Amino acid sequence: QPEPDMITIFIGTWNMGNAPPPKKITSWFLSKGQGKTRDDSADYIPHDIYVIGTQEDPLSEKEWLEILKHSLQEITSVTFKTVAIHTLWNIRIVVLAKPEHENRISHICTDNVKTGIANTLGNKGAVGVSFMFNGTSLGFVNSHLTSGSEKKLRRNQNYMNILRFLALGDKKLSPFNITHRFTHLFWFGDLNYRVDLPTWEAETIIQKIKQQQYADLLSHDQLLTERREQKVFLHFEEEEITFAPTYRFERLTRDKYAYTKQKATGMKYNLPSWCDRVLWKSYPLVHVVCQSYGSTSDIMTSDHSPVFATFEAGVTSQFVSKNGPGTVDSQGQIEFLRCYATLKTKSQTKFYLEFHSSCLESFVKSQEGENEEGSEGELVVKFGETLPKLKPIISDPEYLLDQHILISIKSSDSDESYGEGCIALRLEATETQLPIYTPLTHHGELTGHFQGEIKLQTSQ
Ligand SMILES: O=S1(=O)CCN(Cc2ccco2)CC1
Numbered sequence: 493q494p495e496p497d498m499i500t501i502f503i504g505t506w507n508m509g510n511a512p513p514p515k516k517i518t519s520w521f522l523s524k525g526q527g528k529t530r531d532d533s534a535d536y537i538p539h540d541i542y543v544i545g546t547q548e549d550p551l552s553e554k555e556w557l558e559i560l561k562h563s564l565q566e567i568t569s570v571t572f573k574t575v576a577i578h579t580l581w582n583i584r585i586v587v588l589a590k591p592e593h594e595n596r597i598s599h600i601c602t603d604n605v606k607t608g609i610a611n612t613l614g615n616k617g618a619v620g621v622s623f624m625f626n627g628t629s630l631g632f633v634n635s636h637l638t639s640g641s642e643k644k645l646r647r648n649q650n651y652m653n654i655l656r657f658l659a660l661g662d663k664k665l666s667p668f669n670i671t672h673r674f675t676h677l678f679w680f681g682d683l684n685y686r687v688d689l690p691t692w693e694a695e696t697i698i699q700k701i702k703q704q705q706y707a708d709l710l711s712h713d714q715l716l717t718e719r720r721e722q723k724v725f726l727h728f729e730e731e732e733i734t735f736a737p738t739y740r741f742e743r744l745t746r747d748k749y750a751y752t753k754q755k756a757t758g759m760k761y762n763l764p765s766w767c768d769r770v771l772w773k774s775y776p777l778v779h780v781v782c783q784s785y786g787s788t789s790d791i792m793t794s795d796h797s798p799v800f801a802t803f804e805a806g807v808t809s810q811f812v813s814k815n816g817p818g819t820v821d822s823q824g825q826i827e828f829l830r831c832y833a834t835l836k837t838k839s840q841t842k843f844y845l846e847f848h849s850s851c852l853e854s855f856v857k858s859q860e861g862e863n864e865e866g867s868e869g870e871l872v873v874k875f876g877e878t879l880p881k882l883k884p885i886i887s888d889p890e891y892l893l894d895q896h897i898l899i900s901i902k903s904s905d906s907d908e909s910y911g912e913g914c915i916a917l918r919l920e921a922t923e924t925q926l927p928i929y930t931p932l933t934h935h936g937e938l939t940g941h942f943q944g945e946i947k948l949q950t951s952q
Contacts, residue, residue, distance in 0.1 A: 512793065859878050
């Protein structure tokens with residue numbers, strides 16, 4: 493039985509509004525309703541992995557797992573295996589996989605982050621799961637961010653706390669947060685960003701939704717505008733939204749948006765909004781294609797509609813050679829030429845690099861770089877031809893061209909990372925000097941850039 497080089501992944505997010513689900517939820521897992529929907533001819537074809545995020549989930553883990561498994565079994569005639577389940581308060585993540593994948597999945601991790609302080613600590617935060625699928629690392633985050641149209645900056649702070657503090661993936665990748673630890677990272681949930689239009693415009697917004705005219709609403713969606721201004725979710729992707737706002741509905745129908753202020757809402761308006769979202773970030777030049785992104789129309793127990801997204805995702809095999817794992821493959825090498833980091837910092841410490849990759853036996857520390865002043869005020873750290881030659885464990889180009897090098901630039905004085913990025917080895921040529929580039933981030937915000945040239949030697 494050959495190992496796959498692609499899988500499909502289902503991502504669901506549903507804020508259940510503290511109510512039990514209806515008896516049939518299959519439309520969610522079939523990607524049927526409004527938006528980018530899945531073709532009927534695929535209904536019996538199981539996804540490889542199903543990741544279900546709920547918020548305001550009133551069920552026990554047992555109760556929800558039985559509903560999920562019975563749902564998938566009815567659709568596909570396959571009995572899915574539970575990879576992981578993790579709950580923080582009423583925020584939950586379930587990962588299910590086809591039974592044939594059970595011995596392809598390992599290194600399963602779960603964690604949660606509680607956001608806020610005092611008043612604002614006790615119901616918002618995130619849960620996550622990570623694991624390896626053969627040679628590919630996968631991370632999943634379900635977050636319930638702060639509510640309210642006038643709290644976008646709190647949501648952005650919630651995001652940074654979650655990516656800083658959620659402890660998933662390989663703990664040896666110590667300079668890197670979750671935005672660099674995975675081949676593919678999916679971040680979804682009730683992100684709670686709203687359509688920022690005046691309250692007086694509520695009925696006009698409803699009119700537009702009835703006409704399926706979303707453009708003047710999406711141009712005011714806080715998540716898209718905050719992303720465009722680089723305030724949140726830097727270097728993440730989202731499919732185009734072509735489904736109606738998923739919040740706030742009257743329960744038991746989808747015919748009415750319930751937007752007006754009530755004692756139950758703290759006297760806040762809830763204008764129709766795309767609260768419920770799926771975003772992703774994959775390493776450079778790895779295959780990832782969104783094949784559905786939409787909302788169900790027939791699940792009406794909550795004031796939110798469920799959201800689905802599905803993806804093709806490239807995966808690699810657990811490579812063994814005569815040499816690595818457990819030795820190098822002298823036929824292989826990675827050289828950096830003429831590299832420099834440009835940093836936004838005001839500090840004047842010396843800096844060194846760390847190179848991390850599962851194609852190395854362990855991470856590699858560089859010598860300190862040479863600091864110069866840039867023309868427009870910046871710090872330029874030059875490494876010259878001084879960088880250590882990296883010795884991959886396997887030299888086969890079918891393995892090495894699919895790998896990635898994570899880079900951290902660290903202060904000599906504090907050993908703290910001032911920026912993290914990632915370089916793909918999926919090059920146009922081997923034995924050839926080629927330009928490389930990554931932006932550098934720290935705590936998910938832009939801190940600089942790293943650019944230079946690479947020269948990769950494989951056994952071919
Ligand atoms: O780096 S990008 O692929 C990120 C997405 N966009 C920009 C964008 C549009 C809306 C919000 O942000 C193109 C460049």
